[PDB]
Structures are given as C-alpha cells and as structure tokens.
Design a protein around this ligand. Structure first.
Ligand code: ZN
Lengths: 60, 49, 221, 162, 159, 49, 49, 49, 93, 164
RNA sequence: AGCGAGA
C-alpha cells in the first residue's frame, strides 16, 4: 500500500503547502491534490549543506 | 562551596575589619537546598492517588 | 644535577609534551619566558619607543626623502625590528599577569580561554599606553586595563543579547543590593522597596528585571 | 643529520629546534603550523603521482606494508576518480544555518564569530606569535565544537553543565 | 581600663558594651577574657583583656573632641586629587583609620559634594555608614537621644 | 481568555484570585493570577479499567 | 616486605620482578605515573600519596 | 593559619507559617536556621561570635 | 501571490573589490547609493563613472600617535641617540 | 522551489567557493536581537538584510510594506521585501580570518586527512592544533652545491665550538 | 531537562 503511505507522511504530517490544499479539497469536495515534498527533507538538506556537505538534487 | 568562597575572600579580607556576619555568604547553601528539593531526582512529586 | 634519568624526566616533560588540554597547553606554554624587573621594563620601553620612532621617520623619508647610507640604514632597521622584538618580550612576560588576573572572573558568563584572550587584548593596549618616565611599576597599570578589557568582554560577548556596560553595571548593582537586603531583611524586597532604596521608580526596577532575563534551552506552554 | 636526510611532510616537535633551524636556515625550507599548513601540504600534493606510486607498491610489495598502502589507496583513489579536490577538507568559510534553529546551537555560532573577530583584530594590531597562535587554536576548537561537540576533548558545556 | 557598662571604642565595631571577663587557661594560661557585645553588630567579642589594650582599646571622648569636630566641620578650602579613584581611596583610608576627625571631614566634604550634585551609590553607602558611626559616637558622647543627635547634626551642619 | 480545554466540563467548585493588586506574593511580572477549580463526577462506563 | 608478605610465592615473585630499588625511586615512578606533565621532585611525592 | 572560623549550635526558629497556609499560597513550609559562628584571630587573640 | 502585475524593480550592477557584477533589484525608479553591500563580504560600486568620493576616516589610533600624546620629540631623539651609539659600540666600539 | 525532478541526488565536499556562493550575506557580528525593541540586528545572526524579513512583505525600516513591492530591496536597510518563510531557506557564511580543518575528515578514524597525506593521527593532531611544526617545501641541486659550502660552514662552527 | 505511570 504505497499511495496511502505517501499521503500519510506527506500531506497528513509535514507538507506545509499540500496541507491547506487537502483541507480546501475536502471542504469544497474536489479531488485531493498531488502530494509535494515533505518539509522535513528540506531542513535535512539545509543542515547537511550547513556541514560543508554540498548536497544537490539533480533533475536528471 | 560556601567555604570555598570564604577561603577565597580571606586573602582580600582586611584584618580586624571582618566579622562572621559579613564573612559568611549564605546564598550558595540556600540555592543548593532549593535546587535539591526542586528538580532533584530523589525529591519526587507526591503521589496521592 | 647531572641526573640523566631526572634529566630524562624533565626532557619528556618538555620535549614530547602530551598537550592534552587547551588550558593546560597554554598554561605550560606561558611559563617559558621568565619575568623582568623595573630596569628591564624601562630599557625595554625605551627600545620599543626608539623602534617606533625609527619606523615613523623612515615612513616620512620614504616620500621625497633622502637615500640613507647603507650602514646607518641597516642599523636603524635593526633598531626598528628590535622595537617589535621588545614589545613581544614584554607581552610574553606578562601573559602570566593576564592569566592570574583573569582567574578571578571564571565560572560566570563565558569560557576561560576567552577571558585569557580578552585580557591579552587589554594588556596589548596597556603596553601600547604605558609610560615609564613617571616611574611606576608596569603591573599596576596593566592590571586596570586588563580588568577593563575583561569587564567589557563580559558585558558584550557573555549573554546571547549584549547588554550595554552602563546597563550591565546598574543591573549588577541591583543584584548586589537585593543580595544585601536578603541578608539584612531575610525576605526578597518588593519592587517598591528597591525603588526607594535606589532613588528610582519601581517601573525601572521591573524593567531591569525583565532585561536581566536570558533565554533558556529550547530543548506559555 | 636532520638536514642530510630531510624531506617534507616531516613533523618537528620541540619548536626550539625549529626556530634554531629557521634563524640559521631561513631559506631552504618553509615550515608552517596549523590548518593553513595542511592547506599548503595539500596544495603541493599531486594526486596522480601518489596514486600511481601506491598502486605500484601494492602490485609489487607484500605484507603489512601493502596493507597500510591499500588502506590509503582507498581514499586516494576516491579523490582521483572524482572531480572533487582535497581542498574541501580545510575550510576558509563556515556556512550559517538559516535562522530557524532559534538558543543552544545559536550560542556555538556566537562563539565562533567572537573568536574569528578577535583573531582578525589580533592580526591587524600586530601581536606576538604566541597570542595569535593560541587564538587560531581557539578558532579551530570552536569550529570543531560547532560541527561536532565532544568528539575531541571535553564537550563544550552550556548552562546547567550540559 | 575595663568597667562593665563602658562602650569601648574599637573599629569597625566602634563603641561596644562590655559585660564580664573570663580567666580561662587557653594555650595553658588563664589570662583574662574581656567579653564585649557591640550592639551595632549585635555580636560578642571575648577578647583576652591582656591584649585588649594591645589591640587598641579606648573609652568615650570628652567635649574637647566635640568642639574640635565642630571647628573641623567649619573648615573650608579642601581640594582633592583630580581622578575620582584616588580621592575615593584617600577618604576610604581616612575612614579605615578610625579617627573621628578624619571620618567627620570625609562625611562633611562628601555631603557638600552630593548636595551640589549627588555623586553615586557607593559613596552614598560610604556616607551612610560614616554618618551612622559618627552620630552614634556623638550621641553617646553627649548621651543625647540619638534621634536628637541626628537633629543636632542636622542643625550644626547648616553652619 | 482562559477557556475550558477540549473534552472537559463540570461545576466550578472554587476560584482563587491571587493578585498583585491585592498585594499577593505573585512571581515577578504577573499582576493577577487566577485559578479556577473545575470538578466532575465521573461514572462508570465502557473503557474504564 | 619479606617479613610481612614473604609467606606467599606471588609476593616473592613480584619482589624479584619489581626490578626497582630505592624508596626515592619508587616514589619517583609513582609520581611520574600519577600526575605526569609536571616536573618530578622528591618533595611533592610523599605529599601526593 | 593566622585566623580561623568555626560554627556551632545549630538551632531552628518557629515555622514562619502553618502547614495549610504554606500549601495555599505556594510558599515553602520552612523555618529559619541559625548557627552561632565564631571568628578567631591567632596573631592577637580574639573570638567574635 | 500575483505575478501578472506588481511594482516593477530596476537592476543596477555594483562592482566589488574583486570585481563581481551585482545587479541590485531596487525599485524601478528610485535613488540608489554609489556602493552597495553584497554577499561578497564587502560593498560593490556602480560600474559607470560617478564617485561621490567616500572620504574614508583616519585610523582611530596608533601606538606612535598615542605615544606622541604622552611624550615629546626631544627625549625620544635622545633615547634614539643613546641606542644608536650603544649599537655602534657593539659593532665597532 | 522543488518538483518531481529529483531523478538523482548528489553529495560531495563543499569548497569555500561553493559556501560563499550559497550565502546571501556574511554575518560578522555576534548579535541576535536588540535587548529592548526585540528586532534582529544588522549583520547579526538573524540579520534581516541577509536571511530576509521577519514578517513578510516589508523591509526593516518599513519604507516598502505591500505585495506589489515583491522582489525589491529597500535602499535604507537593504532588506529584500518578499515572503517571510524564505528565512528557512537562505544561508549565511562566516569568512574565517584563518583556515580551519573540518573535523569529520580529521578525527573520524581512519583519519582521512591523515591517510591522504600519510600523516600519523597524533602527528596530524599536533600540527592542526598548533603543537608541532611541519615542513612543506625543500631544495635539490643548488642544495648539493651549498651543502658542500654548508659542509665547510659547519666545519667552521664545529671548530669554533670545539675551540671554546 | 528531570520524575512517575499504562500497554
Ligand atoms: Zn527599509
């Protein structure tokens, strides 16, 4: 069960932009939007960068 | 701690101008007892269930 | 002594030094140079002043000056380097003064090595502004300057939010008086009592209290 | 005899001998102390020659010597194959985590900045080698504590002795 | 030299009421122990009477010193070293000497100063302590209702 | 304003108004500390142990 | 040592293996091992123990 | 060793307030503690208590 | 966050000590300084030739300057003479 | 911001150039916030000129305060007027007066610096904590020629010390 | 941060 996991860990917990969006979708009755990137991954990125560890997310 | 404070200040205590009352600083003792009875592990919040 | 095994003990103590701890390392490092006496202090001063004057005059003569002769110039540059040498000798000699006096301020605010360094800064200033012609021992004067430097440092780089020195002194004064009034009364004086004692308003008393607050670990409700 | 077999990357304890060498041998070697010494050591360090020499040693030499040589070859090859130079190990600038950390960690940063500023002032005024050297060591320790407190030496402690 | 009831002057305790005496064999010798409770500190000093005079025991002063403190209070033309610290040290040593004249000079000079401007809290504490000891000494010099000693001090300072 | 936390209800047994205005020994900064005592009579039901 | 401790064989064993003669030498070795980094002396060793 | 300080005769005054009041107004049910100090000067000879 | 319209901003390059282009997004029409602080650690200055001439301040203090405020030239010259002749005696006598 | 285009993630050593490229400023003062007005300081550890405005859409002094001023920098205080959440995104950097070595590559056994330079761990530590000097360059052929000259000069010095 | 407790 993969989609429910992603839902849980992203838009139920962390994703600061999706969260208001799912609330809006529920209130208004629209399809739940697509999940974004959880806000904890970016704090990790900033902390690793802060350790002089150049961490980059290549597109492809 | 209090005795350490006293012993330290004795080098700078002018002779004959000193009395115990001005010589003894009680604050460390009261601080120690307070920080004991509050936040010491063996001073536990009473359990009156 | 001619005790080669005791010689070996001392030689281990100084040759393959463990250098375990920072303060231990610095403390053993500062004992290398011996102390000096008043005639040494004044001669050393005269040396640094002469070197500084030589540097000034050569700065002046570098511009539209004169091509000084080889022997005189080499001697005068020797004097210029000797001036800085003398300043270094004095500073290394009195690092022990710095450490002795900064000892008295440990345990509150900040680390120890920071206090030692700020005292080193106070004493570099003191030697910068030291006069022998008035014929006073150096330690007298340098003590006051180090004390000022350490107190200024404690004012600035001690709390997460620097409080200005006059504010620091008045709040410290309030702390001392309330301590004394606890001794003389046995109860924490009310803000009104402190205000009347200080000839200020209780509003300022409470404002001092609020400003004395410091953030605690973040690791109402 | 120290000279007649002298070559670099060679430590010298008991700085008395060092200052003797410098005053007598001001030229013919440059001796450094601290992180910038390591920076210079890495500057005069060609990865390809050392990697080739180590590979030759492993291919022809055997025993414990080979085993150490293999250990180093791991990291040396790691730097060769990748485009990252070993300059990254020595730091000229320390990044500042954005202001959300908000003051346990912040205080460490304050310590670093205090010591850096004091060092800058000490170099500017002109200070004895001893004081400025000690200040540099303090800056090193502060950055150490910031990236990892307690790894080397006693951990930097805060209020409440923690 | 010692009489029960006499407030012997000995600094910084100043005048101290003497109770009794103890011939005790401390150190293998029964030499006398004059006991004196100083109400100012509310503490008892059982000083060996043998060395009580040695340390500087003295009785209360007469009226010659009384008039003298008045004349000194009216003494003009006092100048101090420019730097504040050295003058503070000088007047602090003058107090630490224990001489009534020196403390009177310090108190009156510091009052005219702080009346002119109002200097600081440390000097306020110094003035408070010095004035307290002086007014106690004067009140017991005349046995004159220590509050009334405060008032006569307030009047004579007017000059 | 002080509001009943979620999931609580009952009678107001006692209210204590310790105020700096009343010259109570309030900690430095608070001017008026009020404690309200709410009591509830809990009866047995599913889930109770 | 033989008088008090000689009865056991381990004590004789460690006596011979000690290869260390002189009270000054024993106190020297201990002081060297207890507070190293400081200059050994034959005055501040008895005080140490 | 020129001067010494000593303590003796610990004693307790009456509690500053009764149990229920101490419980009510947060104040700690405590009593004053008194010790008779004694300061001695060896050079001249005095005892201040 | 509307992106179809907003108060436009102009961009002006500020050359640094190490010559770093720094196009500063300031209001489309607004006054700007000759030199602007940047992440380079210092302040870069507009490339086009203008110069308000910052007129940097004198150095706050110097050991020589501070010495002049407690001594005079003559005694320092005398000490210089003494040191010189002592050294000359050391070299040639 | 970020999208699903995360096909590859890369980690590597960050050189000083990269560090000062990331930074939006250079903190140079150990001041968090004013004790009285409770606002971030200039060039402090919370400087609004570097990490952005504390409350969204206004500069420090307040010359610009609304959304149409998006992406603008106020000349008076230099605060870039934008969203406040960017304070979780922007980094600073401290330009160290002297170089320092990153601990991870120093103390983590095996000491990767030590293996790279073939320096024994205790030795390396004594170097980088200012306890023992290290050479970094030496001479070769002219070394031979002045070694003969230096053999003569040490013959002279040895003869002098033997004479005393 | 520290205490005590349920499964
Ligand atoms: Zn603005």
């Amino acid at each position: 069960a993969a989609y429910t996991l992603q839902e849980l860990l992203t838009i139920k917990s962390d994703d600061t932009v999706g969260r208001v969006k799912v609330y809006e979708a529920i209130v208004k009755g629209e399809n739940i939007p697509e999940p974004g990137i959880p806000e904890s991954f970016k704090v990790l990125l900033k902390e690793l960068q802060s350790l002089c560890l150049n961490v980059e997310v290549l597109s492809s | 701690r209090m005795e350490r404070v006293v012993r330290e200040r004795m080098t700078t205590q002018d002779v004959e101008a000193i009395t115990p009352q001005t010589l003894i600083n009680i604050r460390p003792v009261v601080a120690a007892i307070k920080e004991f009875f509050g936040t010491s592990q063996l001073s536990q919040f009473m359990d009156q269930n | 002594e001619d005790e080669s095994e005791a010689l070996r003990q001392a030689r281990k103590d100084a040759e393959l030094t463990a250098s375990a701890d920072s303060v231990r390392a610095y403390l053993k490092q500062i004992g290398k140079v011996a102390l000096l006496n008043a005639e040494e202090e004044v001669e050393l001063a005269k040396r640094i002043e002469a070197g500084l004057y030589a540097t000034q005059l050569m700065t002046e003569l570098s511009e539209r000056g004169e091509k000084l002769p080889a022997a005189q110039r080499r001697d005068m540059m020797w004097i210029c380097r000797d001036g800085d040498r003398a300043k270094n000798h004095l500073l290394e000699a009195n690092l022990r003064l710095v450490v002795s006096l900064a000892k008295r301020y440990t345990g509150r605010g900040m680390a120890f090595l920071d206090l030692i360094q700020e005292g080193n800064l106070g004493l570099i200033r003191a030697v910068e502004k030291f006069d022998y012609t008035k014929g006073y021992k150096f330690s007298t004067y340098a003590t006051w300057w180090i004390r000022q430097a350490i107190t200024r440092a404690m004012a600035d780089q001690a709390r997460t939010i620097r409080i200005p020195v006059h504010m620091v002194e008045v709040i410290n004064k309030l702390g001392r008086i309330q301590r004394e009034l606890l001794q003389d009364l046995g109860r924490e004086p009310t803000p009104e009592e402190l205000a009347k004692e200080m000839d200020i308003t209780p509003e300022k008393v409470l404002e001092i209290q609020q400003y004395a607050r410091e953030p605690i670990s973040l690791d109402g409700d | 005899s120290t000279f007649t077999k002298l070559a670099p990357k060679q430590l010298i304890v008991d700085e008395n001998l060092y200052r003797e060498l410098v005053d007598r041998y001001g030229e013919y070697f440059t001796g450094a102390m601290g992180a910038e010494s390591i920076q210079k050591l890495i500057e005069n360090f060609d990865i390809d020659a050392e990697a080739e020499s180590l590979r030759d040693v492993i291919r022809n030499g055997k025993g414990q010597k080979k085993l150490r040589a293999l250990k180093r070859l791991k990291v040396v090859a790691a730097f060769q194959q990748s485009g990252n130079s070993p300059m990254g190990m020595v730091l000229d600038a320390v990044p500042v985590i954005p202001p959300e950390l908000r003051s346990d960690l912040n205080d460490l940063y304050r310590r670093v900045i205090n010591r850096n500023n004091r060092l800058k002032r000490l170099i500017d005024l002109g200070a004895p080698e001893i004081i400025v050297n000690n200040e540099k060591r303090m800056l090193q320790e502060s950055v150490d504590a910031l990236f990892d407190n307690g790894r080397r030496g006693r951990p930097v402690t805060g209020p409440g002795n923690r | 030299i010692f009489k029960v009831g006499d407030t012997v002057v000995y600094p910084h305790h100043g005048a101290a009421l003497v109770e009794a005496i103890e011939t005790r064999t401390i150190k293998g010798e029964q030499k006398e122990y004059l006991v004196l409770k100083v109400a100012q500190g509310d503490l008892t000093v059982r000083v060996p009477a043998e060395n009580a005079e040695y340390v500087g025991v003295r009785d209360v002063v007469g009226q010659e010193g009384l008039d003298k403190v008045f004349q000194v209070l009216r003494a003009p033309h006092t100048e101090e070293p420019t730097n504040w610290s050295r003058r503070y040290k000088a007047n602090l040593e003058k107090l630490a000497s224990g001489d009534v004249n020196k403390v009177a000079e310090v108190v009156r000079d510091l009052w005219r100063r702080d009346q002119e401007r109002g200097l600081s809290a440390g000097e306020k504490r110094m003035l408070a302590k010095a004035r307290q000891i002086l007014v106690g000494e004067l009140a017991l010099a005349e046995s004159t209702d220590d509050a009334k000693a405060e008032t006569i001090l307030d009047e004579v300072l007017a000059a | 304003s002080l509001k009943v936390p979620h999931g609580e209800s009952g009678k107001v047994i006692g209210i204590r108004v310790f105020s700096r205005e009343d010259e109570d020994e309030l900690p430095a900064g608070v001017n008026e500390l009020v404690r309200v005592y709410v009591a509830q009579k809990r009866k047995i039901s599913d889930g109770d142990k | 040592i033989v008088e008090r401790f000689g009865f056991s064989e381990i004590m004789r064993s460690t006596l011979e293996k000690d290869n260390t003669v002189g009270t000054d030498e024993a106190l020297l070795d201990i002081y060297r091992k207890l507070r190293p980094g400081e200059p050994p002396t034959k005055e501040s060793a008895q005080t140490l123990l | 060793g020129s001067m010494s300080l000593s303590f003796s005769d610990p004693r307790f005054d009456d509690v500053k307030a009764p149990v229920d009041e101490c419980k009510d107004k947060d104040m700690t049910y405590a009593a004053p503690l008194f010790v008779t100090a004694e300061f001695i000067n060896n050079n001249t000879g005095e005892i201040k208590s | 966050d509307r992106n179809h319209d907003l108060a436009p901003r102009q961009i002006a390059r500020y050359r640094t000590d190490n010559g770093e282009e720094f196009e500063v997004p300031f209001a489309d029409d607004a006054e700007i300084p000759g030199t602007w602080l940047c992440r380079n650690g210092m302040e870069g200055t507009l490339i086009e030739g203008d110069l308000p001439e910052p007129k940097k301040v004198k150095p706050p203090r110097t050991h020589w300057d501070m010495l002049l405020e407690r001594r005079s030239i003559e005694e320092l010259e005398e000490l210089l003479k003494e040191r010189l002749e002592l050294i000359r005696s050391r070299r040639r006598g | 911001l970020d999208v699903n285009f995360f096909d590859e993630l890369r980690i590597g050593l960050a050189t000083a150039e990269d560090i000062r490229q990331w930074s939006y400023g250079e903190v140079k003062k150990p001041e968090t916030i004013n004790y009285r007005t409770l606002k971030p300081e200039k060039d402090g550890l919370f400087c609004e000129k570097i990490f952005g405005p504390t409350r969204d859409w206004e500069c420090y002094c307040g010359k610009y305060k609304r959304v149409r001023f998006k992406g603008i920098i106020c000349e008076r205080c230099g605060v870039e007027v934008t969203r406040a959440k960017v304070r979780r995104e922007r980094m600073g950097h401290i330009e160290l007066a002297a170089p320092v070595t990153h601990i991870w590559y120093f103390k983590g056994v095996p000491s990767r610096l030590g293996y790279l330079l073939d320096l024994a761990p205790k030795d390396l530590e004594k170097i980088i904590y200012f306890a023992a000097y290290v050479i970094t360059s030496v001479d070769e052929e002219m070394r031979h020629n002045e070694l003969s000259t230096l053999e003569a000069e040490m013959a002279v010095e040895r003869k002098a010390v033997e004479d005393q």
